[PDB]
Design a binder for this molecule. Structure first.
Ligand code: HEM
Ligand SMILES: *[C@@H]1O[C@H](CO)[C@@H](O[C@@H]2O[C@H](CO)[C@@H](O)[C@H](O)[C@H]2NC(C)=O)[C@H](O)[C@H]1NC(C)=O
Ligand SMILES: OC[C@H]1O[C@@H](O)[C@@H](O)[C@@H](O)[C@@H]1O
Ligand SMILES: [Ca+2]
Ligand SMILES: [Ca+2]
Ligand SMILES: [Mg+2]
Length: 336
């Protein structure tokens, strides 16, 4: 053990700098420990930084990307021009400055900001935090980030190459429970992907399985499907993964228990946090990560819809008993 310069007790002196980074992030980047756009942007960033990793390219003698190396910041000049990386510039520059000021690697910083940001959203599990990733990195090869217009086969092959099973793909998607879109249909800027964009809950899994009946915007944007109610945006990839036979049963099992969702997500994130590195080479500073307030609401089928309005796609398993709310159909406000 060690007692940091500010009284904070911790398990390794390497963790001490992280207490200052936490105070900076919570005060400035997160504007007072809030769960708003910055957390959502950072979650996009962690996935896009880490997923630039490909054992297949490497086995073939090409550079496959360094994974969770902070390349998205170090080489943003290249990576931020990738089609899937739009609307990230400002967040990346904000993060670039904190890492430079505290002398922490861009790779560790992205993982830390992710774990910290999630602590600001009720319902979130406490993400593991390892430190020690080298600050050096090479730009990620292009075409390694799954897109919303991709087929399930395509998404699974790419993610499978990175090292994730179909189950883990569904688990990692719990992040869309704290999501909106700004670039798929700018006419409905920040339309959320679930009714609770500030609560890490199973609503996303439930709501994407409902029959699509509504066009929330003036028109249908890129990769946009009909959603279940006004204000909610539904992206094609999500609607497809919810219904595909390879992923439908896992998606269905995520509807009933926030606890189980959180456990699986934490596990898949721990795995994604070290793509490109050896975990037994890093230092564990999980003790620095704050806890999120608990979510006590029960998973519900909102606004009068019933299991009848759910497009049950898992045959082997019956759809769980969930609480039903009374009507009318809600109309979602833009995510903050
Ligand atoms: C199967 C792959 C996935 C695809 C195809 C996908 C696609 C997208 C797209 C197109 C957007 C809309 C962004 C915009 O237009 O502003 C978005 C939002 C988001 N994605 Fe994903 N995503 C996937 C997996 C993930 C994963 C694994 C994470 C993180 C762990 C994640 C976290 C987020 C978050 C939090 C947002 C919200 C951004 C905001 O509200 O500003 N996504 N995603
Ligand atoms: C991590 O690497 C980056 C570059 O990859 C370093 O960033 C540069 O830092 C200098 C000051 O040290 C700035 O004037 C440059 O603008 C930065 N460049 C970029 C692309 O951001 C960073 O300082 C390194 N950090 C550590 C702790 O080694
Ligand atoms: O309060 C406004 C909300 O009402 C609902 C729909 O009209 C949404 O498109 C909108 O966000
Ligand atoms: Ca990367
Ligand atoms: Ca939610
Ligand atoms: Mg009905």
């Amino acid at each position: 053990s060690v007692t940091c310069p500010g009284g904070q007790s911790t398990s390794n002196s390497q963790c001490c700098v992280w207490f200052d980074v936490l105070d900076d992030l919570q005060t400035n980047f997160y504007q007072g420990s809030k769960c708003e756009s910055p957390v959502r942007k950072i979650l996009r960033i962690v996935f896009h930084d880490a997923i630039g990793f490909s054992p297949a390219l490497t086995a073939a003698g090409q550079f496959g990307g360094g994974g969770a190396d902070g390349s998205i910041i170090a080489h943003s000049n290249i990576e931020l021009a990738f089609p899937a990386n739009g609307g990230l510039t400002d967040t990346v520059e904000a993060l670039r400055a904190v890492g430079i000021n505290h002398g922490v690697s861009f790779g560790d910083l992205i993982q830390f900001a992710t774990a910290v940001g999630m602590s600001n959203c009720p319902g979130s599990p406490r993400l593991e935090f390892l430190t020690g990733r080298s600050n050096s990195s090479q730009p990620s090869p292009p075409s390694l980030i799954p897109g919303p217009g991709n087929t399930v086969t395509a998404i699974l092959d790419r993610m499978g190459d990175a090292g994730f099973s179909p189950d883990e793909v569904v688990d990692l998607l719990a992040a869309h429970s704290l999501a909106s879109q700004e670039g798929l249909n700018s006419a409905i800027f920040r339309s959320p992907l679930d009714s609770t964009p500030q609560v890490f809950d199973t609503q996303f899994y439930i709501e994407t399985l409902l029959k699509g009946t509504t066009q929330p915007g003036p028109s249908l944007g890129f990769a946009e499907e009909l959603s279940p109610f006004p204000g909610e945006f539904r992206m094609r990839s999500d609607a497809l993964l919810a219904r595909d036979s390879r992923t439908a049963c896992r998606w269905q099992s995520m509807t009933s228990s926030n606890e189980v969702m959180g456990q699986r997500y934490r596990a898949a994130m721990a795995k994604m946090s070290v793509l490109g590195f050896d975990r037994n080479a890093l230092t564990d500073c999980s003790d620095v990560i704050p806890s999120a307030v608990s979510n006590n609401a029960a998973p519900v089928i909102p606004g009068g819809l019933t299991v009848d309005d759910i497009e049950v796609s898992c045959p082997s398993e019956p759809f769980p008993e969930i609480a039903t709310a009374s009507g009318p159909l809600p109309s979602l406000a833009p995510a903050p």
